[PDB]
Amino acid sequence: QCHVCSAVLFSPLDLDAHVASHGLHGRHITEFISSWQNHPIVQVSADVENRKTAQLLHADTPRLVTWDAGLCTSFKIVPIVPAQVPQDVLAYTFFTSSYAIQSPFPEAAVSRIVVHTRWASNVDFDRDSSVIMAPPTENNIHLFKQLLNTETLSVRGANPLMFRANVLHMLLEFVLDNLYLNRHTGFSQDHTPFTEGANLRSLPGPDAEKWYSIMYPTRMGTPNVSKICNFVASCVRNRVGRFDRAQMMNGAMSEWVDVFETSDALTVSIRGRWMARLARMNINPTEIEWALTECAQGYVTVTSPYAPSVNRLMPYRISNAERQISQIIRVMNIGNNATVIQPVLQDISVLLQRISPLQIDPTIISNTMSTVSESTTQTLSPASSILGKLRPSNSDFSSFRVALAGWLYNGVVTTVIDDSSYPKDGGSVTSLENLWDFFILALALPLTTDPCAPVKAFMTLANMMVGFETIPMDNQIYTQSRRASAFSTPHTWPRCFMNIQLISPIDAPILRQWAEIIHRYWPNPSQIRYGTPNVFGSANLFTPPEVLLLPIDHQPANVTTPTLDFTNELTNWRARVCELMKNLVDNQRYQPGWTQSLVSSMRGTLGKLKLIKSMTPMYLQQLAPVELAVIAPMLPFPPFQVPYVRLDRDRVPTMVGVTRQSRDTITQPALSLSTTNTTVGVPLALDARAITVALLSGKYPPDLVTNVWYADAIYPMYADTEVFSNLQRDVITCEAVQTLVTLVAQISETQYPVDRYLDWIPSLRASAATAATFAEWVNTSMKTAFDLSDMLLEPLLSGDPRMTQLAIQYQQYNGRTFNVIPEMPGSVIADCVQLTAEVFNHEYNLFGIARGDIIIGRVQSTHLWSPLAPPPDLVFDRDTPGVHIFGRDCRISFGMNGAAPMIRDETGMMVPFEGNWIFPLALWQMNTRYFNQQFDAWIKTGELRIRIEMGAYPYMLHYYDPRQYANAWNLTSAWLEEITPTSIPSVPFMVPISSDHDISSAPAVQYIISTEYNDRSLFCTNSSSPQTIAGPDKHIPVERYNILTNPDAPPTQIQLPEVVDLYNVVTRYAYETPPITAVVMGVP
Amino acid sequence: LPGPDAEKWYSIMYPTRMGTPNVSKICNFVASCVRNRVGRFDRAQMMNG
């Protein structure tokens, strides 16, 4: 068996599996073992199809650590036109065995760079967010037909008002994938004459030879004369394979290596900074021990021993701000929905009932009061009349346990005594039943969280004594006989209750005593610490990070304290209420109609109610605060409290709100739903009957040792703890919030400044109805990768998501507010999206976008000038002389009797259908059927050419050989007919093909040409020839292979803002994620 | 609008929403008007949701 954690094991394979949790080399989540008994408890993930003899993890945990084997890149090079050439050197010969020449690049006529997300990878759990691109000869409209053009009149085009939204969602998917730590996988030494003595990497799988040439362009030699074999001759030779390995290791393989392989800087930078984020959450099992020992408030001592290592990682450390923002999201979940509050309070009630040493026995009242009694002979006795109300039955005491559980959640739900627990019809002193109803009510009131409970306690008696004693009031319509249930808001508090000197003891000698007893002996609030502040954080809004505001005072706990302790606050309260109820009856000033002297029976049974023994005022004062302190850090919804006040009318919290907008802005008042309550939160009725029975009867077992009971009861609910999964989830929530405020401000008008990278991609001033639809796709893309099925950013989407910073606040009575604004820490997914937006600003081409505009005009010639890159002869602008800019009111008047038809210049003139023109793109969508009726005969035949200024546009290609005829009208007119007022089909080009030998010279007619430089996604033309005579030539791009051709360059160096490189250092890891073990020992 | 067809009413409501391709009298009117006076331009959003 195991001597570390003292667990009994059976097979030696199970011993080698069990020491792996301790870190000794030889599907669980937590593995705890007790010290006094033999019962290990093991958590396991809840999505398993066959759970057995184990415990479940019902929290929605995110999948943080996810590994990757394979190439760390996202750019693949595809061939577009295949073309094989005659070859000089065919194969290598060692002795007799022949080896085929494998090329790193596709030997084709035209090679281009397309973007497929990871395209060669071995992954245990995919993120389900792929940016997959077809080659540019195929259609490329489904990538932009994604978010908001869901009603489109043309199902093959994309809405031009939504380019920025679709592109930002694409960049969010590109950053939200490649969230992988790559895996160290094992090597193999080479002795090829072109790669001599270099430990090359080898992928896992059936064959390792498959990927060597695709990785390493150096490894293929220079056997012949071609565009690759004059490149490898320029390349350098000592930079391939492993560069630097770790020192410490296990077995033979190292902990981390630096390898040279094909990659790209844009992926390896995102993965490096993602690793740098996850390494900053690393926790120590010694800190786990400190956390649980400090959190248990004594009563146990955990321990978690381990073996010394560095490669383990246990990401569990967050900051207080990242905890508080997720607390604000959990508060915004509710929105006056009592359904999302009910199971929380009910299950905390059941748990708090089953932990507690106290059982509420029924027999204490029954061994004293005796239903028999019949003092008089006419009607019921006082002793038999109180039992008909108390009803000491064993139904339940949920109205007591939920009242205890409601102390934790003050700013959400408030506990009151239900209506029709008060005296019926106002009540009168002259009746027997209403006195006991007032007794039950005034004994049950001080456990509610209602801050107007003392005013209700006073005005129930002041309502009951109408017609015997008079008090002054203030209004002449809020008289003395107003029902005590209606005093639920602190503006209703009477001045006669506030200053008790105005109650004259001549007129009200009993109401004066009651108003004095409330102001003297009402219970005092107090506070106690819980949890750990340094580890686990603290979700405490408006309170210091380790306090638990209780509405009752507490002393240190012992069991041998006397029951009739009048220093105890609730016992003092019971004694004073019984004494005033005695002094009311003693005189018979207030009960005429009692034809017999019931004052002896009444005074005797009130003496019995005063001197009853019950250890619930002992329990609520000693052992209930430490149990709340033990339960409270292991909750899904950690306690949201708002400060308790005793009688301070100047500070009573009346309203709690959550603010989405910024600080230095003035917008519409978007008050949250939680402000629309009469009380501070959702109301909650409780029965005073069961609360009073619970106070009057409750005892311990006779063999109560606290160090046995609590060390026993703490252990299973810490074995099923869920603090760790919540700490993992709050990072994802607090990261998604900042991702939302960074991405929505790019497409809407918000004064919040973040860096504004792409503007030339056109879009619209988005309203709330558009921004909410955008943010819903952002939300589900955040959820799909991190494997969640519960809330994330979903309370944000309840109208106006155009927001800046979360903030929460309440106000007092006197108007003083409190604004708690948690500072936003460093986000990671947001500034990775900003980095890839900066990089997309420089390669707009590789994702299928061009800059600039379109010139539609007939160019008929022989030349091979490749309309992705035009000469300056054909292009013009606003500054070109003799060019007519057209505004919005382009109006066409027909010519009469042979005159030419004219169109309205924006300067007010009329110009004929001739020359160099300028459109905005919006005009052609305003009048798409009227225009091509008028303009197509002049573009095709006449001298009319038109600039269409549009910013960004997707595009597709059509190659032709220039040995034959070519005409672009059947494509150009097909593009111009299909532009509808709500979408654009992707702009069709045709560029020539490149050849090595010289060709014929056939005429061609081109209409749609670009204006600025666009031929960047093209990798290399005619890759196997020595050169390219006719056509657009392109060598291998030497600026992307920097660390192979620049001899003075450190291998870390990356030119990532300007152009991403495709080969650099990447660092592969072999970490360990052990489960979370502890040995829970009991304390004497 | 609520009703059988709100498709018809969107040209009755907004005259300056149409395009101006013509030198017809309707379009001579619409081409000489102010752009930013359509739809809602003021609101009172007192509570979220």
Partner: peptide, 19 residues
């Protein structure tokens, strides 16, 4: 619903081919 409300606003003003 919002999809119907947007689709009517876009389909209220479209234009077709001549006869």
């Amino acid at each position: 619903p919002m999809s119907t409300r947007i689709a009517e606003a876009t389909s209220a003003i479209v234009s077709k081919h001549p006869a």
